[PDB]
Paper text:
Three well-characterized heme peroxidases (cytochrome c peroxidase = CCP, ascorbate peroxidase = APX, and Leishmania major peroxidase = LMP) all have a Trp residue tucked under the heme stacked against the proximal His heme ligand. The reaction of peroxidases with H2O2 to give Compound I results in the oxidation of this Trp to a cationic radical in CCP and LMP but not in APX. Considerable experimental data indicate that the local electrostatic environment controls whether this Trp or the porphyrin is oxidized in Compound I. Attempts have been made to place the differences between these peroxidases on a quantitative basis using computational methods. APX, like HRP, has a cation bound about 8 Å from the active site Trp while CCP has no cation leading to the suggestion that the additional nearby positive charge destabilizes a cationic Trp radical.
In addition, we have solved the crystal structure of an APX triple mutant that has previously been shown to enhance Trp radical stabilization. The main reason we solved the APX3M structure rather than simply model in the mutations is the uncertainty of how to position the Q204M mutant side chain. In APX, Gln204 extends out toward the surface while in CCP and LMP the Met points in toward the interior and helps to seal off the redox active Trp from solvent. Our initial computational studies showed that the results changed significantly depending on how Met204 is positioned which provided the motivation for solving the APX3M structure. The three engineered Met residues in APX3M are positioned just as they are in CCP and LMP and we made the safe assumption that these three Met residues will be positioned the same in pea APX. While the addition of these Met residues into APX increases stability of the cationic Trp radical the effect is much less dramatic (rows 7, 10, 11). APX, of course, retains the K+ site which indicates that the Met residues cannot overcome the destabilizing effects of the K+ ion.
Residue numbers in the entry: 2 to 249
The structure:
């Protein structure tokens, strides 16, 4: 039930020009994974029952960057600040979600539809809504389902975002990439999850919880066998995530 707001022609022109500048900047800086993490941690605080949190620009606030789950995302905010200043008409909320969409595209992933119009909100949500990497399937459903309002399919598809990037012992404490090509958006996260622990690669307990759940596991198997189906479900889930609490 989405009803996207009207924005001026000047706003739309800035969206299009920022999208191109973000492509070049994110590719040059090699920061696609960090920008995807920034957009996801912006959006993933949404609570459907209270309509609080969500992708409304609050992740730039020092109070929210200080949340433990956001360790290292101040690097991403600082990286984007000069470019954001070239587009004063855009909300921070739209700019960070656009950066996440671009991060997926420039690494070869699907083209996630983007609609402008998010307004920046004044207060960050309370800490503690983002998922815990040491927990399992029940926790995943509490966070993605009971709070955000996403489906079990969305959970598995979105966790394929770990197909790009790595953990860092100085940030979360976990260390290493999920896949052998961590700047290439493909279905290798599911390939590695199924194949078992390879040396040099890393999987979180929350990743491994997908394998034993009766709903998540068929989805893992489908995405490992069919990258096209992963790309379709990923783009659907990323769009929903980026629009939580927005336009209904
Ligand atoms: C659902 C449970 C999830 C958990 C428990 C989780 C946890 C983590 C952790 C612990 C890290 C390592 C941070 C660090 O040490 O640098 C990380 C990185 C990352 N996460 Fe997730 N995450 C989840 C879902 C997602 C989703 C839904 C997305 C996006 C669609 C995502 C995108 C990323 C990316 C791209 C990185 C790599 C960042 C980099 O390379 O600097 N994650 N995640
Ligand atoms: K990959």
């Amino acid at each position: 039930g989405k009803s996207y707001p009207t924005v001026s022609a000047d706003y739309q022109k800035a969206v299009e020009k920022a999208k191109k500048k973000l492509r070049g900047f994110i590719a040059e800086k090699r920061c696609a994974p960090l920008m995807l993490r920034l957009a996801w941690h912006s959006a993933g605080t949404f609570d459907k029952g209270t309509k609080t949190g969500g992708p409304f620009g609050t992740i730039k606030h020092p109070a929210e960057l200080a949340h433990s789950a956001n360790n290292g995302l101040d690097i991403a905010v600082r990286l984007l600040e000069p470019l954001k200043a070239e587009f004063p008409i855009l909300s921070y909320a739209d700019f960070y979600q656009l950066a996440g969409v671009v991060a997926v595209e420039v690494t070869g992933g699907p083209e996630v539809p983007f609609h402008p119009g998010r307004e920046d909100k004044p207060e960050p949500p309370p800490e503690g809504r983002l998922p815990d990497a040491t927990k399992g399937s029940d926790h995943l459903r509490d966070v993605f389902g009971k709070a955000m309002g996403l489906t079990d399919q969305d959970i598995v598809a979105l966790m394929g975002g770990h197909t790009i990037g790595a953990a860092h012992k100085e940030r979360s404490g976990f260390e290493g990439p999920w896949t052998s090509n961590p700047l290439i958006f493909d279905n290798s996260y599911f390939t590695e999850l199924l194949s078992g622990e390879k040396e040099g690669l890393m999987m979180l307990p929350s990743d491994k919880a997908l394998l034993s759940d009766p709903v998540f596991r068929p989805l893992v198997d489908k995405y490992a066998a069919d990258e096209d189906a992963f790309f379709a479900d990923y783009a659907e889930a990323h769009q929903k995530l980026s629009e939580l609490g927005f336009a209904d």
